[PDB]
Amino acid sequence: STQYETQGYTINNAGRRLVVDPITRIEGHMRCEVNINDQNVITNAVSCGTMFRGLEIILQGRDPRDAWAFVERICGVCTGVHALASVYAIEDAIGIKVPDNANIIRNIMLATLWCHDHLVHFYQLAGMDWIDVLDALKADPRKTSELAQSLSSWPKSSPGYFFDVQNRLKKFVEGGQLGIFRNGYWGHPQYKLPPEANLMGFAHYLEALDFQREIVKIHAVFGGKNPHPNWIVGGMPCAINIDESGAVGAVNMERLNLVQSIITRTADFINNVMIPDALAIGQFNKPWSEIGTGLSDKCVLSYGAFPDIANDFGEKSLLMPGGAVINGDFNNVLPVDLVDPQQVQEFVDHAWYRYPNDQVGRHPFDGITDPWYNPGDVKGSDTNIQQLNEQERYSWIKAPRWRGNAMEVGPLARTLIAYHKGDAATVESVDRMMSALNLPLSGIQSTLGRILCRAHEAQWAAGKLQYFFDKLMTNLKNGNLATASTEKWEPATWPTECRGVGFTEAPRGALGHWAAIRDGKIDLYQCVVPTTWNASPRDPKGQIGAYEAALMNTKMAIPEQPLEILRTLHSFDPCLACSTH
Amino acid sequence: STQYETQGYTINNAGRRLVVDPITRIEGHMRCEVNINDQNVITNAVSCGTMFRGLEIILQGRDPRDAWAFVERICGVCTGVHALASVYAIEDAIGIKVPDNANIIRNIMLATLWCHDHLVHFYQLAGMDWIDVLDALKADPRKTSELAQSLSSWPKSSPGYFFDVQNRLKKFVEGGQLGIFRNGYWGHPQYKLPPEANLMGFAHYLEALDFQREIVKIHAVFGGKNPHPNWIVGGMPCAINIDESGAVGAVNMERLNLVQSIITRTADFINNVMIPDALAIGQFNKPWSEIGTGLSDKCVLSYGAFPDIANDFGEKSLLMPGGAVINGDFNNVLPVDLVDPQQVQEFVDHAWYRYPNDQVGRHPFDGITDPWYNPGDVKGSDTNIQQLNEQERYSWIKAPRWRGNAMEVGPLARTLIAYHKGDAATVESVDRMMSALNLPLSGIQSTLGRILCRAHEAQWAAGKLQYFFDKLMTNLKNGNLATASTEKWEPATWPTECRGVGFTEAPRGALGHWAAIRDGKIDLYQCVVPTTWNASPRDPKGQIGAYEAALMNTKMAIPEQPLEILRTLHSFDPCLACSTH
Amino acid sequence: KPRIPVVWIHGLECTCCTESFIRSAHPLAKDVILSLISLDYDDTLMAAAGTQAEEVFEDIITQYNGKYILAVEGNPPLGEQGMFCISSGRPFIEKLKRAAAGASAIIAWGTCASWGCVQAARPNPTQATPIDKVITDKPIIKVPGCPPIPDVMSAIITYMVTFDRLPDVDRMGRPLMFYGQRIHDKCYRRAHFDAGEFVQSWDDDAARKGYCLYKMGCKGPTTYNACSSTRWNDGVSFPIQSGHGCLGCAENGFWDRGSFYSRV
Amino acid sequence: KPRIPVVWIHGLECTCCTESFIRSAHPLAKDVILSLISLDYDDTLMAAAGTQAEEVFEDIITQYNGKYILAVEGNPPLGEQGMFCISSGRPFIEKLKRAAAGASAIIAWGTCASWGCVQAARPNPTQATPIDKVITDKPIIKVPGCPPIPDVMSAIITYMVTFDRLPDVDRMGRPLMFYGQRIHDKCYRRAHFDAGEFVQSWDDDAARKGYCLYKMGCKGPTTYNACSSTRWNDGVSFPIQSGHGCLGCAENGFWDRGSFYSRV
Numbered sequence A, B: 001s002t003q004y005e006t007q008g009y010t011i012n013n014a015g016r017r018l019v020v021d022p023i024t025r026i027e028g029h030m031r032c033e034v035n036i037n038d039q040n041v042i043t044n045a046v047s048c049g050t051m052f053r054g055l056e057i058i059l060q061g062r063d064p065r066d067a068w069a070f071v072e073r074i075c076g077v078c079t080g081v082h083a084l085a086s087v088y089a090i091e092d093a094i095g096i097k098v099p100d101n102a103n104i105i106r107n108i109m110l111a112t113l114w115c116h117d118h119l120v121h122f123y124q125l126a127g128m129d130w131i132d133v134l135d136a137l138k139a140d141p142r143k144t145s146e147l148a149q150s151l152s153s154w155p156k157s158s159p160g161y162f163f164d165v166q167n168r169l170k171k172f173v174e175g176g177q178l179g180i181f182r183n184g185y186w187g188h189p190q191y192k193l194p195p196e197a198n199l200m201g202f203a204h205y206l207e208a209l210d211f212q213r214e215i216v217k218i219h220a221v222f223g224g225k226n227p228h229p230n231w232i233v234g235g236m237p238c239a240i241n242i243d244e245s246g247a248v249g250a251v252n253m254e255r256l257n258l259v260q261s262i263i264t265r266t267a268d269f270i271n272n273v274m275i276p277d278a279l280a281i282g283q284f285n286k287p288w289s290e291i292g293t294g295l296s297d298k299c300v301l302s303y304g305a306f307p308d309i310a311n312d313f314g315e316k317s318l319l320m321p322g323g324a325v326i327n328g329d330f331n332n333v334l335p336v337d338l339v340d341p342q343q344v345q346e347f348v349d350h351a352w353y354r355y356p357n358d359q360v361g362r363h364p365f366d367g368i369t370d371p372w373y374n375p376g377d378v379k380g381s382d383t384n385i386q387q388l389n390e391q392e393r394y395s396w397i398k399a400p401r402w403r404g405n406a407m408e409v410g411p412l413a414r415t416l417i418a419y420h421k422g423d424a425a426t427v428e429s430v431d432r433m434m435s436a437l438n439l440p441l442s443g444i445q446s447t448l449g450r451i452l453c454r455a456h457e458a459q460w461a462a463g464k465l466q467y468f469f470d471k472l473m474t475n476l477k478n479g480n481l482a483t484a485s486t487e488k489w490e491p492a493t494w495p496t497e498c499r500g501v502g503f504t505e506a507p508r509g510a511l512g513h514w515a516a517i518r519d520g521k522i523d524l525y526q527c528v529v530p531t532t533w534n535a536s537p538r539d540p541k542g543q544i545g546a547y548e549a550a551l552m553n554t555k556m557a558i559p560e561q562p563l564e565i566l567r568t569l570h571s572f573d574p575c576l577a578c579s580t581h
Numbered sequence C, D: 001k002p003r004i005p006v007v008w009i010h011g012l013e014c015t016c017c018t019e020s021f022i023r024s025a026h027p028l029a030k031d032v033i034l035s036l037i038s039l040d041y042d043d044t045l046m047a048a049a050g051t052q053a054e055e056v057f058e059d060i061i062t063q064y065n066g067k068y069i070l071a072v073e074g075n076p077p078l079g080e081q082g083m084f085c086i087s088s089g090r091p092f093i094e095k096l097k098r099a100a101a102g103a104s105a106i107i108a109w110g111t112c113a114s115w116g117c118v119q120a121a122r123p124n125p126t127q128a129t130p131i132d133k134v135i136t137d138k139p140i141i142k143v144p145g146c147p148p149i150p151d152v153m154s155a156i157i158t159y160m161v162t163f164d165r166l167p168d169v170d171r172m173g174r175p176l177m178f179y180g181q182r183i184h185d186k187c188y189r190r191a192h193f194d195a196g197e198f199v200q201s202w203d204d205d206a207a208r209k210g211y212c213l214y215k216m217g218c219k220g221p222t223t224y225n226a227c228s229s230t231r232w233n234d235g236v237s238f239p240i241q242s243g244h245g246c247l248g249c250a251e252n253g254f255w256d257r258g259s260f261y262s263r264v
């Protein structure tokens, strides 16, 4: 065994090894291993992406106009965000400016995704880490109603409703076919909600499962379908016609009315169901404001998103702020430049890829994706891994760093950056949330805080949906209908050689696509995705990524039952297909 | 002034004359006049249909296969029922038998209409006679929630919800733009609900206004659209294809899944919102179990409906019983024959039509529709009716009688027929309902009883939707897909001369269409519609119809404010376009 | 902020157009009534009756003279001195003219108000007449169909509220947005029409595959409406999708253009 | 009564097919899981992880051997001895083979499981391979699309449960009900195609009138799916209706049939 120090942690791989493979209630394929000491405290953590497809390779030689459709299929959970980054990158390369309505519609598509993705994550992915579903069978329906009504104005709170939900669960488990609940961690000492809060949360899980299907109708209006809506380089394909013949063949007043209806319903659900449930989880699990801090009190990163001024990606335009903090210096939010070769770099010394020099990082315009499955001296064999060897290569995920620093990305990171840049709405929102919990601001830098920030962002995005919708309607009232710029649609109009960067904030964090075009074809296409940051393996200096850091020092009540590991990993909302692409 | 005796009533046109024109919260155009005595009790009542279109005349010369489409436009509230009666009448004339799935789908269409029509009547048409909407502004939201939760398991009951509803109403009223609530009867002493019940009822009014749009999606699947779905002579046009190529072009599993979803939601809404609301109206308005009896303790009529055996309209087939009671003799439910010239006859001595002899009644196969606007002396002019002359002609509605007897039709009539034929489900439901209200059975024969019966029927129909759907699915599992018979589609296959009768129970009561075909065209088309019975004018013997009878003997608190008149008339669910056609 | 006053009157009708209106899915009719307009008079929905209702009518048309929108469902009959449709003891046509005189604009809902509809079909016993033949000095927007599509009704309302203008119209007064193209120009069965793939009798193999309804009398080729694109009842179906040809119900005189089952 | 056991496994994938399934409007996915089937294993949704999840897998495929349906999303890679997709430390293909052996039948959800989808596009770095090239001794129902339509997925499931049989399929193993006709055989813009009325550049006057997308690369003419009839997201839209040509996403090899913007 070995021990070394990095980032304030003592990484020690002596002692008992625990393996969690598969990690469930994530998107895609992940393995996690830890070592625990005699005190059941994690002293080493290992993050492994267990899938790879090779989109960066597949994109070579394709028409740049097609790229969005391929990269959209990086992920069906964060569906659309890779298309958006792609069109941004190709437009940056070629020098295309889109019309204002296309920008506004793209912002609507992104905000819709934030709302949908965050909602489903909270309930379907992370929820059962916090809510003991079987304990809901012991609740009193009247006390459940009283609790729900004390937390929210949401209408669906009658004792009869909660009794009906409880009886549905009773029937479900009566035949002994427990389905997704089978062999869960129910009764674990870290489940702290009272029975009535478990029943409330389970009711809401079911309400969210039904409701989420509505949100994405906005994607269907503008983008044809969800999952995986359609886009174009130059704008959007959803031509608008409000008051002319043939409006039945376009985005018309009836289609816009549908969008408005969905926006209102989405805001209402997020504000009155998800927000109070997040706060309730906080109230009953305050010790988790001190667990899973990881890198969130050290190094955080946001590129920024939602340009309000069309084709302007600067600080004055982006509604979701960008910036980086390192060394725990939140007084110094630093600007990020995605073209600077000294800023974003990926390392592969601990990943399954070949570089000419694996001891150095490569900026994505110099990126290389040459897969090399070489797990080395594992316990087991290369097709039957019992334990990965984290001293060697152990993941399909590359290791991104920012100026050589390991960073956390995602809702908590964005919230910290916006708060410390002095965004008024963010400061007010965070302050009021922490005051409601009687927790210090540092309590947000934690597993609990990641969940709280994610719920807050869903509320933020639902509000922004209305803002963007109203901006679109203002344009239409002024006779501004344009949705595509086509003067550089044809390849003969493009530079013979050019390159571009497309960036945004996906639900899970900072996303970038770097593209080079030569002679009308994709010459290079490199993606660095939010879960690539968070789930990163180690670098040549032994620096650990956000997941490995957040797991360090965590106490486990029952080593064989990885509830605490799942809680912290799920708080980051891992998307493994994203991470590996 | 004159007085005479009929049906146990003393019809006396001395005293003050009151006019209500227009009657609102009905379908179509009605005028009502009454006389009141010195104790403000009604001693004379005059029902007048104030519109006529002439569909019976327009239908002459049409192709019988087209007739359903014309007559469907008798009414957009009871939309579909006239199409059903038409296809039945034409099939009866020609000798067409439809496939079992067509009959099942037609029964689904009719049950859907019962659900939809009864729900909208309860809330949007009648509800404001019972709920003082402006008094809802004085309610305590917590007490509203408690009340709602004591009545029902319906989820939507939180104090916050009721506060939000109340605040929406406050904001609506605050600028003086009271809309549909302007100059209402609010504060009338006959409004007996406490403020919390008024707020509950108003909230449900809004929920029903939203929800009703869903119910008719069943008509859209099988019939293309609602209002006014499509039908065919010989079955239905909605061809079924479950497991073959091209199912995308037909009623397929996805379409059937949609129908199932709607059925479930419809039953939930009716059982947990409308039913408890109806019972609550009963509990707080018990004196109305003794008001508006009219003909319901004397003479009631049903033709029956919902043939369960395809093409069999006999007693063993009809799920909704037919029969007639006269002279208060409920121990002898009499059979009805729509071909018998001595049974259904229409009189026009008090209506705006010409017969060769207006002192005799005409069976509909001998019917005549020759309009003759002739109001006589009306204290104004032919274009300014100040007071109808009920000694002479006073309505566009013909006067139907059964064996010379004036009859009540509709939900209460049907309930009484089924009860006294010994339908087990009906006996049990009625007895349990009257017990829960602590009222004698005779309390059902009243204005309150009409309302309670209608709500019961909506529940019955919602249950029958599932029964019919299940029957369809059973046929499909057995490989029986047929939806149309076309052996006699072509006119060369028809008898040169034939006649037929189509009958059913519309939401408002007994409906018949009598059709005679000659040389491939309609020679005669006569309709007798439920509101024609109920809103009937007088006959040569001076016998009064159901509305006039039910208004007789009623006390008015405030003569100038016709709330009691509205309550009783609305309890019959008047459809004036139906009545006059 | 005050909402635009709307007066909704009813002539000879079946009430299909009111019923369609309340089916609207987006915006809900609830939200139209509570938030977008002030529906200040409407016999089918209003609390007041009789003299109380007529006091509302008179007050609204006087207070808001020149500023209210008049919605008309149904039509006036000219026969029997107008007394085939009696309103407060007088011919409906008198109420129509009074309401029209104060309106800023008129919406003629449905084929009744637009063209005549079923009561105007041969032999038109009541001399039912569309609004534009009676009211000749006001803007009239025709929104035909029996009834029009619910979400088309509400989209036209939201257009007028949002944009503060009447929709642009064709030569017949119909909004271009929804009536500019034929049913047959946007019909999902057009591939079959173009291929000569037709239903020949009900429930035949062609019908079970969704073949074209032209030989069964579909009037889509001559009918302007939005049914084949926007569809009915929140996108659920339309006549042709459920297996019946278009009747032509948005077109002037459709009842008298031959049998529904005779080919265009 | 017990519900039919289902085991849902995931190879190389983006999870679009799971996401599509949970979009189902009728029946709701909630009701499919609670009342129609027993969803006994599914990494995306299940409470258990790691050793506890693999105990579920083992227990279900043993207790219900021969009696469960295997749903497959994604596909197995053959490259790097299968270790492009690692499940419990071993190649995913080993898990697929173990799950298939006990299944009564297999549902290959999406273009990944059916054909290969994006990871199989040139140059196919991982040697991603569709299920029917690995499992050759079990009935496999292909339900292609990237992803398939939500309500098609749920309708296929309800068919199977209600009728207690697999759906009838074409020669490629796709259910005839939804995959028997081409997008272009039921496309509402087909009137425009047949008239030569085409969008020529994005947001041109033709595009604003809903003209045909053929010249913009629409692959509807060669694509079998239900999108032009059933539509997407509870009938709201489909690619063409929102102005983009069909990509051909339900067809084998669609990624390598030329640019999406080249004509068919």
Ligand code: SF4
Residues within 6 Å of the ligand: C183, C184, C185, C187, C188, C189, C190, C191, C193, C211, C212, C213, C214, C218, C219, C220, C221, C240, C245, C246
């Ligand atoms: S069904 Fe009617 S509208 Fe559609 S293509 Fe055929 S004829 Fe035209």
Ligand code: SF4
Residues within 6 Å of the ligand: D183, D184, D187, D188, D189, D190, D191, D193, D211, D212, D213, D214, D218, D219, D220, D221, D240, D245, D246
């Ligand atoms: S848009 Fe595509 S599928 Fe539709 S008609 Fe044109 S080419 Fe065919």
Ligand code: SF3
Residues within 6 Å of the ligand: B073, B076, C013, C014, C015, C016, C017, C018, C073, C074, C109, C110, C111, C112, C113, C117, C118, C145, C146, C147, C148
């Ligand atoms: Fe629509 S009221 Fe019904 S008949 Fe044809 S529109 Fe008129």
Ligand code: SF3
Residues within 6 Å of the ligand: A073, A076, D013, D014, D015, D016, D017, D018, D073, D074, D109, D110, D111, D112, D113, D117, D118, D145, D146, D147, D148
């Ligand atoms: Fe649908 S998991 Fe998403 S990539 Fe195309 S189907 Fe695969």
Ligand code: F3S
Residues within 6 Å of the ligand: B225, C145, C146, C183, C223, C224, C225, C227, C228, C238, C239, C240, C245, C246, C247, C248, C249, C250
């Ligand atoms: S009958 Fe009418 S509803 Fe549409 S499809 Fe034809 S215009």
Ligand code: F3S
Residues within 6 Å of the ligand: A225, D145, D146, D183, D223, D224, D225, D227, D228, D238, D239, D240, D245, D246, D247, D248, D249, D250
């Ligand atoms: S891209 Fe796919 S979703 Fe349908 S319209 Fe074409 S098959």
Ligand SMILES: [Cl-]
Residues within 6 Å of the ligand: C008, C009, C010, C011, C043, C087, C095
């Ligand atoms: Cl009126």
Ligand SMILES: [Cl-]
Residues within 6 Å of the ligand: C111, C115, C116, C117, C118, C120, C251, C252, C253, C254, C255
């Ligand atoms: Cl007409």
Ligand SMILES: [Cl-]
Residues within 6 Å of the ligand: C023, C024, C025, C149, C150, C151, C152, C231, C232, C233, C234, C235
């Ligand atoms: Cl609609």
Ligand SMILES: [Cl-]
Residues within 6 Å of the ligand: D008, D009, D010, D011, D043, D087, D095
């Ligand atoms: Cl799996």
Ligand SMILES: [Cl-]
Residues within 6 Å of the ligand: D111, D115, D116, D117, D118, D120, D251, D252, D253, D254, D255
């Ligand atoms: Cl493929």
Ligand SMILES: [Cl-]
Residues within 6 Å of the ligand: D023, D024, D025, D149, D150, D151, D152, D231, D232, D233, D234, D235
């Ligand atoms: Cl869907």
Ligand SMILES: [Mg+2]
Residues within 6 Å of the ligand: A056, A398, A526, A527, A528, A529, A581
């Ligand atoms: Mg990469």
Ligand SMILES: [Mg+2]
Residues within 6 Å of the ligand: B056, B398, B526, B527, B528, B529, B581
């Ligand atoms: Mg008649």
